[PDB]
Amino acid sequence: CELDRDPEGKDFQQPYTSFVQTKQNRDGLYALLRNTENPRMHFYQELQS
């Protein structure tokens, strides 16, 4: 009797089971890197000079 349920409608974090899941998580990581390393985040090292 296995009694865990996966949420219908969204995926969650676990080891990967296919290749398209890997490719889509990689695209999401690159879209996170886009907003993390902006020019907007590096103005504070420049204005302190």
């Binding site: 080891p15 990689r26 990581l29 996170l32 390393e37």
Partner: protein, 48 residues
Amino acid sequence: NQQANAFVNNTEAALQNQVYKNSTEIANAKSFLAEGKVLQALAIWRLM
């Protein structure tokens, strides 16, 4: 850094359990993992 750690650990645990069905997916997933390690190193170097 947290989400790069999650991606790299999940791709390593998928490459260890042989979930990829042909050789092109393995030859691409190794490159995807090598792409994630650079983002780990960049996100640690910025804080350092």
